[PDB]
Amino acid sequence: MDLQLKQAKLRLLYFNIRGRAELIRLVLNAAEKDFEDVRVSETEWPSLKSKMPFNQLPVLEVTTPNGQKVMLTESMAIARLLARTFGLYGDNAAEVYLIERMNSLTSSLLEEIYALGLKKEAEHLHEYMNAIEMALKERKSTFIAGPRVTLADLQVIVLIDTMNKFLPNTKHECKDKLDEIKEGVIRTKPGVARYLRSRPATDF
Amino acid sequence: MDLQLKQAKLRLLYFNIRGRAELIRLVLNAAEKDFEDVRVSETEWPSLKSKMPFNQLPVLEVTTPNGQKVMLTESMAIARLLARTFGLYGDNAAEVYLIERMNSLTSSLLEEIYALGLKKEAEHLHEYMNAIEMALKERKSTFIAGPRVTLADLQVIVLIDTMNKFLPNTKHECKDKLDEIKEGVIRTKPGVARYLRSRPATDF
């Protein structure tokens, strides 16, 4: 039942984009936990989908220290499990509420931005951006949920990179407040700083 | 920072439907924690939205035992906070992964069902239903995450009621496995059993 994730061998299977696995890559790099970052092309996906017991990516393939292979699914469930394992998910339920309130807003905004890339909404987008900006201005701590980085600050990085690609010229005050969080993650999580500098430059 | 939710006065503001607040109502009734279940019409929403500091429902208005009024937002963040407070969120990160994997599947399926009511997909629906049915058949416990009810078993109830309204004649084997979970929640959580019997019969 306990996968012993600190020691376990970890392989992340996803496409060669940031997308919905970037948050997992950021948690593992923040924790300085090594993993195989396996980037799958859509040319390779049909054959991989046929031999493996899953139908969507990302999957985290865990090999426990005792040799047991377990395939984990559901991107945010994986990210939260890894964050809890490596001390990136707060210390009590009140802090976790702050994490999860912000992640609800930023996850929803991410999915709205993703859906508008090729469909053809600044109002629905503005609503999320105002809520995020408001929470960031009201906080009484350096990071979203307290004095130290948690999963919510890591997902802010995902959100910034998505707004830069999908909404480059959008000029909302929330962008500056998000960038402040990112600056603090880079300062305090040298594994993230190095990863962002070295990761593949991708469009999405 | 700690709202003292066991003792705090709680008012839930949402529309007079099950919708996205039913999970919160189920947690509180499972815990036998009293709350004001305030059901707002769309006739009343414009005026309420103008005087209060929020722009969407549900909101949980908490009055702590020391008299402090705090408005909580984000339906799933509220539900998880309440589940943690009342012992409905497992005991370790491995159990929580089981909760959150299942809630990812059932939340996604719920949102897909909601979006298809008036838009005009059995494939995308079938994918979620097969994954849910598969996890339910593979489990080595009475409930989704272990021997006792958690938030994931409560959201199964939300999913059943939604499939009954939106997909009455759909005949998938996952429906029976979901109904088994619901039967066990009713048996083991007398507060849920009573609530389901007494709650307003609504369309959505």
Residue numbers in the entry:
A (entry chain A), B (entry chain A): 1 to 120, 129 to 212
Sentences from the paper on this structure:
Two crystallographic structures of rTs24GST without GSH (apo form) were determined at resolutions of 1.30 and 1.75 Å and analyzed. The second structure at 1.30 Å resolution was determinated using the rTs24GST 1.75 Å resolution coordinates as the initial model for MR. Moreover, this structure lacks the loop connecting alpha helices 4 and 5. The second region has the highest B-factor values in the overall structure and is located between residues Leu116 and His132 forming the loop connecting helices α4 and α5. In this region, the electron density is insufficient to build any model. The crystallographic structure corresponds to the apo form of a sigma class GST. These structures were determined in a C 2 2 21 space group (number 20), and in both cases, the asymmetric unit has a monomer with Wilson B-factor values below 21 Å2. However, the diffracted crystals obtained under GSH co-crystallization and soaking conditions did not show the GSH molecule bound to the protein. An analysis of the available space at the G-site in these crystallographic arrangements revealed minimal space for GSH to reach the site due to crystallographic contacts, which reduce or even prevent the success of crystal-soaking experiments with GSH.
